């Protein structure tokens, strides 16, 4: 998810935030009208810190939203991991069975992504999700297709 992002959209979003506040450098310096550069620099730094923290928490929330779809498939259902480990511990073999089809994980991914609002809210997240989506769908198909025999 993080790797998908790009600089231009992030800069555009930061500029949009500044414009929405109306707190542009020229207006702020014209407002204060003093040469105490350290104070204005600290004010700007704290503004950017607020924006950065909000972005961090937003992205964390979305990322946790994505992870929940895959996690339940690992421990149980097709491709269960403890079954693999006990297969290894008993014989060293691991019989597998395969069919290509779309199942629960792909449906969950499809439902989650098309509804989520952060895609509309942030262009950066929109592009990142659009780029990362296909890989998520391939990985979900990988989860759903394979089964470890009983």
């Amino acid at each position: 998810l993080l790797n998908a992002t790009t600089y231009r959209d992030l800069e555009a979003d930061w500029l949009g935030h500044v414009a929405a506040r109306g707190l542009q450098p020229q207006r702020l310096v014209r407002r204060y009208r003093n040469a105490r550069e350290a104070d204005i620099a600290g004010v700007a730094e704290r503004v950017f810190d607020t924006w950065r923290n909000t972005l961090r928490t937003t992205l964390l929330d979305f990322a946790h939203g994505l992870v929940a779809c895959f996690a339940p498939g690992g421990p149980s259902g097709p491709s269960s991991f403890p079954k693999y480990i006990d297969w290894l511990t008993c014989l060293g073999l691991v019989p597998i069975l395969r069919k290509r089809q779309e199942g629960g994980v792909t449906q969950g991914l499809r439902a989650f992504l098309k509804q989520h609002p952060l895609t509309r809210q942030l262009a950066t997240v929109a592009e990142a999700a659009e780029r990362a989506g296909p890989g998520f769908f391939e990985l979900a198909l990988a989860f759903d297709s394979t089964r470890v025999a009983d």
Binding site: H17, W51, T54, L55, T57, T58, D61, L118, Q121
Partner: peptide, 7 residues
């Protein structure tokens, strides 16, 4: 104004 994670 606007913020990146608000409704």
């Amino acid at each position: 104004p606007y913020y990146p994670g608000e409704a």
